[PDB]
């Protein structure tokens, strides 16, 4: 059903999260972690304290799709088990800073063609697929976007609800 999903999304905040490659999303799906640059680390730490759920909606650059969405379960933290992210250009592992723990809510993909009717008020009402990494998605748009994804029968939201 969709009822526990709607409960998790109630009064949530939503952020568009870009990945340079599929490998980093695979790592994030296996290990339950994500790292962002400092400008977005501050935004997400602020958001994590501010709302009962912070939802990251993932899209691999140039893929034409979202690859799923996850809920922050922690603020960022340094010094844990290192994650072998595929860094681009000439960026170092230090630039990615802290690691957020995340609980996946949906690991299924959604093509951009299916969210063409959703516009994001916080990005000039452009289609919700459009946004820089870290762009916040307004509540109603983000909720409807998440509800478009195929149900992910492998995930039991019971344990997510207990962390709220």
Record the resolution, in angstroms. Answer: 1.5
Residue-wise DSSP of 124-146: TTEETT---TT-EE-HHHHHHHH
- By what technique were these coordinates determined? X-ray
* Distance (Å, whole) CA 48 – CA 56: 11
Bridge partner list, 127 = 119
What angle is formed at CA 118 by the lines to CA 129 and CA 154, rounded to 5 degrees?
A: 70
Residues 44-60: b if buried by 16+ CB within 10 A, e if exposed: bbebbeeeebbbbbbbb
Locate tokens 């969709």: which residue? Answer: 2
Locate tokens 């977005």: which residue? Answer: 40
8 Å CB contact between 101 and 78:
no
Query: Number of structural domains, the chain?
Result: 1
Locate tokens 């592992």: which residue? Answer: 93
8 Å CB contact between 33 and 78:
no
3-state secondary structure of 13: strand
Give me the domain span that covers residue 159.
Answer: 1-164
Query: What sign results for the dihedral spanned by CA atoms 90, 95, 14, 26?
Result: positive
Bridge partner list, 60 = 19
């Amino acid at each position: 059903g969709t009822s526990k999903l709607k409960y998790v999304l109630q009064d949530a905040r939503f952020f568009l999260i870009k990945s340079n490659n599929h490998e980093n999303v695979s790592l994030a799906k296996a290990k339950g972690v994500w790292s962002v640059l400092p400008v977005n680390e501050k935004k997400l730490n602020l958001a994590f304290r501010s709302a009962r759920s912070v939802i990251l909606i993932f899209s691999v650059r140039e893929s034409g799709k979202f690859q799923g969405f996850a809920r922050l379960s922690s603020e960022s933290h340094h010094g844990g088990s290192p994650i072998h992210w595929v860094l681009p250009a000439g960026m170092s592992a230090k630039m990615l800073g802290g690691v957020f723990k995340i609980d996946w809510i949906c690991r299924r993909e959604l093509p951009f063609t299916k969210s063409a009717h959703l516009t994001n008020p916080w990005n000039e009402h452009k289609p919700v697929k459009i946004g820089r990494d870290g762009q916040e998605i307004e509540l109603e748009c983000g909720t409807q976007l998440c509800l478009l994804f195929p149900p992910d029968e492998s995930i039991d939201l019971y344990q997510v609800i207990h962390k709220m």
